[PDB]
Amino acid sequence: VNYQDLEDNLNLKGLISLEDDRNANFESNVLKNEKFLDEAREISKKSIPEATVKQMSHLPEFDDILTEGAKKVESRINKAITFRPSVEEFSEIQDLVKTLPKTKVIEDLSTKTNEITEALAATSKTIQRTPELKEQLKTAIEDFLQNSQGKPLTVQMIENLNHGLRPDEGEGRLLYKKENAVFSSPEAAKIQLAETVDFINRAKNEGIEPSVVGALVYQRLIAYHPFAEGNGRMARVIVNKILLDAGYPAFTKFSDEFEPQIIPQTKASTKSATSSEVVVEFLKELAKKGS
Ligand SMILES: [Zn+2]
Ligand SMILES: [Zn+2]
């Protein structure tokens, strides 16, 4: 698909270039990453005996038999999140961004903190019903906004945010998941969380339309699902920092019945939404914020 001759002010072409490069290096960075492969082998061996392991240790194919499922899963996820719109989608996105609500006020941290907190509470009845939970989530959000302002996002910031967004769990809880819709493996998720941080930062440096970046970050953070818990909470806060830094109102969630579509589903049928379709829907949902 050639985009050169399409008119573009979102720097959607830069975005597409970013994705092209990441996608082109996906095999090397993920599928052929030895930490990914060894974890995959270790995880696979858990199910198997208990007898059959040492047995098949001598089988030439074994090191691969152990990793074929995990590889397929990551390739599937990558296919779903990689941004490559049709000409019709490219243009639809162009028009849709023009219609987005955007404030002119230079909102302060307290204002941003409250907007993100309220947006989070809207996506959860438990938060709405538990004042003490809402308040401690608000604090984690404030800390995150405070520490990340005018600074490059880091994985460490996201780790601290995830931890802060889980006050409803005892301490000593797992930060990253150790095991597992179909989400990335633990290591694949860690690798690609770091890549997503890179994406967020580079997109800002290249002035790629924040609303589209937010949509893409939303989808892939949910697909990767790196943490033991609080992935939804964390993704929504990160996406909303991206949006609010650009002057957009906070995003809450997709409709009750499009949310399932944005990542690969184990279930055969189940409408699967493509990356472009997710961006289009995200932008539409966002444009309804004013109403
Ligand atoms: Zn802790
Ligand atoms: Zn605002």
Question: 3-state SS string over the chain?
Answer: CCCCCCCCCCCHHHHHHHHHHHHHCHHHHHHCCHHHHHHHHHHHHHHCCCCHHHHHCCCCCHHHHCCHHHHHHHHHHHHHHCCCCCHHHHHHHHHHHHCCCCCCCCCCHHHHHHHHHHHHHHCCHHHHHCHHHHHHHHHHHHHHHHHHCCCCCCHHHHHHHHHHCCCCCCCCCCCECCCCCCCCCHHHHHHHHHHHHHHHHHHHHCCCCHHHHHHHHHHHHHHHCCECCCHHHHHHHHHHHHHHCCCCCCCCCCCCCCHHHHCCCCCCCCCCCCHHHHHHHHHHHHHCCCC
- What's the gap in Å between 145 CA and the centre of ligand 2? 13
- What's the gap in Å between 156 CA and the centre of ligand 1? 14
Q: After which residues is the chain broken (C to N over 2.5 A)?
A: 180
Before 39, cis peptide (omega within 30)? no
Q: How far apart are CA 34 and CA 224, in angstroms?
A: 18
Which residues are 227's β-sheet partners?
176
1-291 CATH pick, 1.10.10.10, 3.40.30.10, 3.30.465.10, 1.10.3290.10 = 1.10.3290.10
Which residues are 176's β-sheet partners?
227
Residue 8: φ, ψ to 5°: -150, 125
Which residues are 117's β-sheet partners?
none
Domain regions of the chain by residue span: 1-291
Q: How far apart are CA 225 and CA 184, in angstroms?
A: 7
Q: Is 230 annotated as a binding residue?
A: yes
Going from the C-alpha of 259 to that of each of 131, 223, 273, 283, 288, the distances in angstroms are 26, 11, 9, 14, 17
Q: Is 170 annotated as a binding residue?
A: no
Task: Provide the 10 A C-beta neighbour count for residue 194.
Answer: 15
What is the residue type of 75?
Answer: S
- What's the gap in Å between 175 CA and the centre of ligand 1? 8
Find the helix packing angle between 210-224 and 275-287, rounded to 10°: 120
- What's the gap in Å between 133 CA and the centre of ligand 2? 23
Q: How far apart are CA 204 and CA 213, in angstroms?
A: 9
Instruction: State the burial class of residue 14 (Cβ atoms within 10 Å of its Cβ: 0-12, 13-18, 19+).
Output: middle
The residues near 44 (Cβ < 8 Å, ≥ 6 apart) are 65, 66, 67, 69, 70
> Using an 8 Å Cβ cutoff, are 50 and 208 in contact?
no
> Using an 8 Å Cβ cutoff, are 78 and 26 in contact?
yes
Among the bound ligands, name the one nearest to the CA of residue 171: 1
Q: Is 172 annotated as a binding residue?
A: no
Q: How far apart are CA 28 and CA 184, in angstroms?
A: 16
Instruction: State the burial class of residue 45 (Cβ atoms within 10 Å of its Cβ: 0-12, 13-18, 19+).
Output: middle
Q: Is 232 annotated as a binding residue?
A: yes
> Using an 8 Å Cβ cutoff, are 66 and 44 in contact?
yes
Of 250, 107, 231, residue with least CA distance to 162: 231
Of 20, 216, 7, residue with least CA distance to 94: 7
Give me 88's structure tokens. 């019709």
What is the residue type of 187?
Answer: E
Vertex 236, ends 21 and 253: CA angle to 5°?
A: 105
- What's the gap in Å between 44 CA and the centre of ligand 1? 29
- What's the gap in Å between 224 CA and the centre of ligand 1? 22
- Name the structure determination technique: X-ray
- What's the gap in Å between 162 CA and the centre of ligand 1? 10
Which value in Å is the resolution of this experimental model? 1.8
Of 173, 252, 263, residue with least CA distance to 222: 263
